[PDB]
């Protein structure tokens, strides 16, 4: 009796995550290179409410250049510098600087980070 309801949740949560990444692509594009936050880039849509930070897979680096895709309008991201050739489609900012993620930084604190 749950034929498509799951396919409704999987679209609502993805649209919410896309709105989040579009609200974050600006707050990243307007910062000096040395004040970016620490991202948990995954190239799979990530949630900011929980994010399941206990998973040993989510990394922690400062974000690089945030580039607006040209085929569609997706806000892709680079990590570190352009010499890593790392390019991601989904990120989340955390105050877990090195590899231990204490907390996920909220939007008003990645704005205030300037």
């Amino acid at each position: 009796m749950y034929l498509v309801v799951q396919a409704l949740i999987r679209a609502c949560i993805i649209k919410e995550i896309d709105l989040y990444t579009e609200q974050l692509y600006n707050i990243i594009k307007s910062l000096p290179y040395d004040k970016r936050p620490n991202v948990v880039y995954s190239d799979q849509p990530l949630d900011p409410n929980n994010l399941d930070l206990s998973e040993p897979e989510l990394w922690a680096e400062q974000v690089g250049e945030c580039m607006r895709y040209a085929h569609n309008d997706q806000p892709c991201f680079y990590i570190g510098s352009t010499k890593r050739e790392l390019r991601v489609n989904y990120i989340v900012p955390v105050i877990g600087v090195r590899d231990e993620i204490e907390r996920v930084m909220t939007l008003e604190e990645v704005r205030n980070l300037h």
């Binding site: 600006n26 307007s30 910062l31 704005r111 300037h114």
Partner: protein, 1206 residues
């Protein structure tokens, strides 16, 4: 010395600086804990209540005193009115009896039955408490004990009500001009039809119900007008006419209804009575405005009933007296001639032809002054009958029938709109948005109110102002309907002021701080009673208000050098010495000051004032009494440095008082220890607001405002007496008008776009937040300090005469000339004393200059954008107040560009004169905004001042020029004001400036007779082959109405091309067009003068098209309405050299010697007229200069414009 340096220090001029007061330190918490706001917010919220109560008491007083009035002159006025005056110098005594009548009604008003304890402080203190029987209504008026000074304006307006100034806001004018008129009118209307109403149907009933004493005849009989002055009087009069209610649902029928039903005869048309007048919307909530709209315009409300009654009354336009319905002369005839006849100026022309056949002789041409007198006689005409308007037309075209058709058309328009608006009139309607943002709801309100109002404005013309026999059978019903229809004005002005009203609000109330005399002045001795001082620390000026109970809290404070010391501003000025010194020295203090009888007896006579030739010893005797008494009266000797002049300087008494007032201003600085006053703040004993505005804040670097400069100079050392602090400050509080759920903010570090397209830098990344209306979303105290610039003026003299004397004796006077335009909002050209153009440009691009860089804000592309914005807004009610608030924030940045030239050139200014001109409907700055410009350029030249100048130098903020008189009224803008010459603007833009040509013909087609007479009125029509031109040698003597010109012998050509309007547009070439026209009909145009050849063709297709090209030859004003880049004026007449004037040959020059556009020509020829006036000043003698006329009439002007260029 320039012409200006003479004009300073002329007269006194008071302004009102404002500021924001920021509560400093712990004063905000104290104002909140002692509760000094909700008290003063409750007062100025219930003050409307005491206004209601005082109006109630005034009405009770008036109705209690008009039961004792007696108009004794009435028994003679009643007979003097119906004399058939036929004035013959006999109605002047009528006017005098009427004046004495309205006065003897205001004798008891002005003199007796109180009127003393009515407008003083007593009424709210002691009188009104008696006059009440409620406790609620007594609590209000008891709370205002001592705060009477919060009324004085109201009481001011309530003296207009008891006087007889012949104004709508008076009692006598109400009960004389609008009662006695209708009283006698209805009395005679009854005398006509007295024996119609038989006894047993109206009299036996109207006796028992109304009064049953002096029943029905006495109210029409005799002088019973001395009974219909109260409110019960006029109520019983309308009970005679309109009827009673008999306190139930009976509603017996009244006299007017009896005349109505007496249409049993079906040929009644009988004149119905008229009532008597009597003395004494929304804008709150969207639902209220919608409810008021529905209740005042739905198909049941009185306005729609009146529209129905007018539709009926004008459907029967045949069965009325076609010699008794009077259209009103004025603006309405201009359009009535377009509706009825078919042209814009048919009626005026028929009337001019008739007046010609009466007053004018059979002279071969009119005379300019004769035509002016004819225009004047037309303007004096009051009204027109429908009979006359029938005479001005031919046969087979009625005038009553055409008007009936037109009015029926307008009423069908209103009905169609009401049909397209039925959705809004349903009782079960609801809104999806707020009315201010909703537009499919405001568009409907506007489409309905514009229909009703443009019906009411086209009907009003049927009044004609006071006449001979009229058609009472028409005007009874007409006035009864129209006086109801007139309320659409109230509705349309109180719904537009709610759909336009901005989202915030500046609604404030006044803070008193538990004290009636708060801040009423700054005096040293009276601090403990006013409780307000102005401390100053560094470069920041603090207000300081003590409290209720610690008035002695700012005295025991010494300097003590603790590295913090507030300064403090003191030494009160002198109040009104001309009455003060007589008061301060003759207040019965002669007991133990002096011994002499000589001074006392000349005091008894009072022989020290005027009323005699003059005396050297008596005047200075009292002068020396005052002098040697102030120099020994210690209260003033120690305070002011009374350094009077010598004895031989005095020549009158006024000099002494002016000197005493000039010397009594010593705003001085005392010191005070900073920690003591700060602790006073912290103890809750001193409220220290800081005066502030964005030019005091430390992060501001540019030029300060003007008023900030005045407020800083109030306390300078080089400000001796020029800008002084006239007492009477105030402190208001503004609550926040924006919910903090409604701020919008350009977020921090987000690149913003720049609205100015002429700005190079096209972004902005600010590192903070830029809120929108941040100032309206917070409680803000504001402070109003009045100042009085040039209080004691020295150089007193009349200016209209001194400017003239200064112009006569000057050899090379420049003249700025300012005129509007079609492609330029305001064109300026400044011409020197000979006629040369020394500078000319447009004010469209205001170039703002700051910090050495200049950025040019356009103001034409911006207004063009807002017009394109208004074009597609569907409601045009807040989108046409934006343009009206831009065009009036543009003529405040033109005023600086004019007060820059007036100082750079010492010029006079030549402005258009708006009482006598008709600018052609496509000029950008319309008249309603120009009048706002000429009134904003006078209020600036009153005290012209340059912000970027040394504040002492002539021109700077302390010694600014005063080159114009104060602004009196919009109709007192004529023929002179200081440096501002108002010159009329006829024959100013369509007049070529190389020669002085102008086009005085009439080149429209009428027939073949007129056209042949035209082509025969020339002297030569010859094709010169060497120039490929068609020389038309004309002499202005043959044609008509050309008495204005001077040369009268012109050689027109066909040079250049023209731009036919066709709204299409087509560029035609004149020589080629003439060749084609002459070939199309086979006219050998190589036989020199082809005049006789031209009068051969006999069709209507030739002279209908030849007149077209002949008109295109005399145009000189070619426009395209599509490009500002190609507009030009060209003249068809060679000048003294041989070349034509082609304004396209000067657009490509840096500083030409002739007008470049066709708008620089307008302002150039507006400045030349003032050069001609200056010319006139160089003739008369300095005693006659006050009499030289300036209104340069067209003949003089054309002469001056055609002789100057040789």
């Amino acid at each position: 010395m320039s012409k200006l340096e003479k004009f300073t220090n002329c007269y006194s001029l008071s302004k009102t600086l404002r500021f924001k007061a920021i509560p400093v330190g712990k004063t905000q918490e104290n104002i909140d804990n002692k509760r000094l706001l909700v008290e003063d917010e409750k007062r100025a919220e219930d003050y409307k209540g005491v206004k209601k109560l005082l109006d109630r008491y005034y009405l009770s007083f008036i109705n209690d005193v008009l039961h004792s009035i007696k108009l004794k002159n009435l028994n003679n006025y009643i007979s003097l009115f119906r004399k058939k005056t036929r004035t013959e110098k006999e109605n002047k005594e009528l006017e005098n009896l009427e004046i004495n009548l309205r006065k003897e009604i205001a004798k008891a008003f002005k003199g007796n039955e109180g009127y003393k304890s009515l407008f003083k402080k007593d009424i709210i203190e002691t009188i009104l408490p008696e006059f009440l029987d409620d406790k609620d209504e007594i609590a209000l008026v008891n709370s205002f004990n001592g705060f009477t000074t919060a009324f004085t304006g109201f009481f001011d307006n309530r003296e207009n009500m008891f006087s007889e100034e012949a104004k709508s806001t008076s009692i006598a004018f109400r009960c004389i001009n609008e009662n006695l008129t209708r009283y006698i009118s209805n009395m005679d209307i009854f005398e006509k039809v007295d024996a119609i109403f038989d006894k047993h149907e109206v009299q036996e009933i109207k006796e028992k119900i109304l009064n049953s004493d002096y029943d029905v005849e006495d109210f029409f009989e005799g002088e019973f007008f001395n009974f219909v002055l109260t409110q019960e009087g006029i109520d019983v009069y309308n009970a005679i006419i309109g009827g009673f209610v008999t306190e139930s649902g009976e509603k017996i029928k009244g006299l007017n209804e009896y005349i109505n039903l007496y249409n049993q005869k079906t040929k009644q048309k009988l004149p119905k009575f008229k009532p008597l007048y009597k003395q004494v919307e929304g804008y709150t909530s969207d639902e209220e405005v919608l409810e008021v709209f529905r209740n005042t315009l739905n198909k049941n409300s009185e306005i729609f009933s009146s529209i129905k009654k007018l539709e009926k009354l004008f459907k029967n336009f045949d069965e009325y007296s076609s010699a008794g319905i009077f259209v009103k002369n004025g603006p309405a005839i201009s359009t009535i001639s377009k509706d009825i006849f078919g042209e814009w100026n048919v009626i005026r022309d028929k009337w001019n032809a008739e007046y010609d056949d009466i007053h004018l002789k059979k002279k071969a041409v009119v005379t300019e002054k004769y035509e002016d007198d004819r225009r004047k006689s037309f303007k004096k005409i009051g009204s027109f009958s429908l009979e006359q308007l029938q005479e001005y037309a031919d046969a087979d075209l009625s005038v009553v029938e055409k008007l009936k058709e037109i009015i029926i058309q307008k009423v069908d328009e209103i009905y169609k709109v009401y049909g397209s608006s039925e959705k809004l009139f349903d009782a079960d309607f609801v809104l999806e948005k707020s009315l201010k943002k909703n537009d499919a709801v405001v568009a409907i309100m506007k489409d309905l109110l514009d229909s009703v109002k443009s019906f009411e404005n086209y009907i009003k013309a049927f009044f004609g102002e006071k006449e001979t026999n009229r058609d009472e059978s028409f005007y009874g019903d007409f006035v009864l309907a129209y006086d109801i229809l007139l309320k659409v004005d109230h509705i349309y002005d109180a719904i537009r002021n709610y759909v336009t009203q901005k989202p915030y609000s500046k609604d404030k109330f006044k803070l008193y701080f538990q004290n009636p005399q708060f801040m009423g002045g700054w005096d040293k001795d009276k601090e403990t009673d006013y409780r307000a001082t102005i401390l100053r620390y560094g470069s920041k000026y603090y207000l300081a208000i003590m409290d209720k109970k610690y008035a002695k809290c700012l005295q025991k404070i010494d300097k003590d050098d603790v590295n913090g010391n507030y300064e403090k501003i003191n030494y009160k000025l002198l109040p009104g010495p001309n009455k003060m010194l007589p008061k301060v020295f003759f207040s019965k203090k002669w007991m133990a000051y002096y011994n002499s009888e000589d001074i006392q007896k000349i005091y008894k006579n009072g022989t020290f004032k005027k009323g005699d030739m003059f005396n050297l010893n008596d005047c200075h005797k009292l002068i020396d009494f005052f002098k040697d008494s102030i120099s020994r009266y210690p209260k003033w000797s120690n305070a002011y440095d009374f350094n009077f002049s010598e004895t031989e300087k005095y020549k009158d008494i006024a000099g002494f008082y002016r000197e005493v007032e000039e010397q009594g201003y010593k705003v001085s600085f005392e010191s005070a220890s900073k920690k003591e006053v700060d602790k006073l703040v912290e103890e809750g004993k001193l409220y220290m607001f800081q005066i502030y505005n964005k030019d005091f804040s430390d992060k501001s670097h540019g030029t300060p405002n003007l008023h900030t400069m005045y407020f800083k100079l109030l306390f300078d050392e080089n400000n001796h007496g020029q800008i002084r602090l006239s007492g009477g400050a105030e402190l208001f509080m503004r609550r926040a008008s924006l919910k903090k759920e409604e701020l919008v903010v350009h977020p921090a570090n987000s690149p913003i776009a720049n609205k100015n397209p002429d700005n190079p830098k096209k972004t902005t990344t600010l590192s903070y937040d830029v809120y929108k209306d941040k100032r309206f979303s917070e409680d803000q105290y504001e402070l109003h300090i009045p100042i009085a610039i040039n209080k004691c003026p020295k150089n007193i003299f009349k200016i209209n005469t001194e400017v003239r004397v200064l112009l006569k004796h000057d050899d090379n006077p420049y003249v700025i000339g300012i005129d509007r335009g079609e492609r330029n909002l305001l064109y300026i050209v400044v011409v020197d004393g000979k006629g040369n153009i020394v500078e000319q440009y447009s004010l469209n691009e205001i170039i703002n200059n700051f910090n050495g860089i200049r950025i040019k804000t356009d103001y034409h592309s911006l207004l063009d954008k807002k017009e394109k914005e208004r074009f597609e807004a569907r409601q045009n009610w807040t989108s046409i107040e934006n343009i009206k608030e831009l065009k009036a924030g543009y003529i405040s940045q033109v005023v600086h560009k004019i007060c820059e030239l007036v100082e750079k050139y010492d010029a006079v200014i030549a402005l258009e004169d708006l009482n006598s001109g008709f600018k052609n409907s496509r000029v950008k700055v319309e008249k309603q905004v120009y009048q706002k410009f000429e009134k904003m350029l006078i209020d600036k030249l009153n005290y012209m001042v340059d912000k970027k100048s040394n504040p002492c130098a002539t021109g700077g903020a302390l010694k600014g020029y005063q080159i114009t008189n104060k602004f009196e009224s919009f109709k007192s803008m004529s023929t002179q004001n200081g440096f501002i010459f108002y010159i009329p603007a006829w024959l100013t833009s369509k007049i070529d400036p190389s020669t002085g040509f102008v086009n005085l013909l009439k080149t429209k087609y009428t027939s073949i007779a007129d056209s042949k007479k035209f082509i025969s009125s020339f002297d030569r029509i010859m094709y010169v082959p060497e120039e490929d031109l068609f020389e038309f040698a004309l002499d202005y003597k043959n044609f008509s109405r050309t008495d204005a010109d001077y040369i009268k012998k012109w050689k027109l050509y066909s040079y250049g091309n023209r731009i036919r309007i066709f709204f299409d547009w087509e560029e035609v070439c004149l020589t080629s067009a003439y060749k084609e026209l002459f070939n199309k009909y086979g006219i050998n145009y190589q036989q020199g003068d082809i005049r006789a050849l031209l009068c051969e063709q006999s069709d209507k297709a030739f002279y209908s098209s030849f007149m077209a090209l002949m008109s295109l030859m005399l145009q000189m004003r070619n426009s395209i309405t599509g490009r500002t880049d190609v507009d030009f004026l060209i003249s068809p007449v060679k000048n003294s050299d041989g070349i034509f004037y082609d304004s396209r040959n000067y657009e490509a020059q840096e500083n030409a010697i002739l007008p470049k556009n066709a708008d620089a020509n307008g302002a150039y020829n507006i400045a030349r007229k003032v050069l001609w006036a200056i010319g006139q000043f160089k003739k008369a003698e300095d005693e006659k200069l006050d009499k030289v006329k300036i209104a340069i009439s067209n003949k003089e002007w054309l002469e001056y414009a055609q002789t100057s260029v040789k």
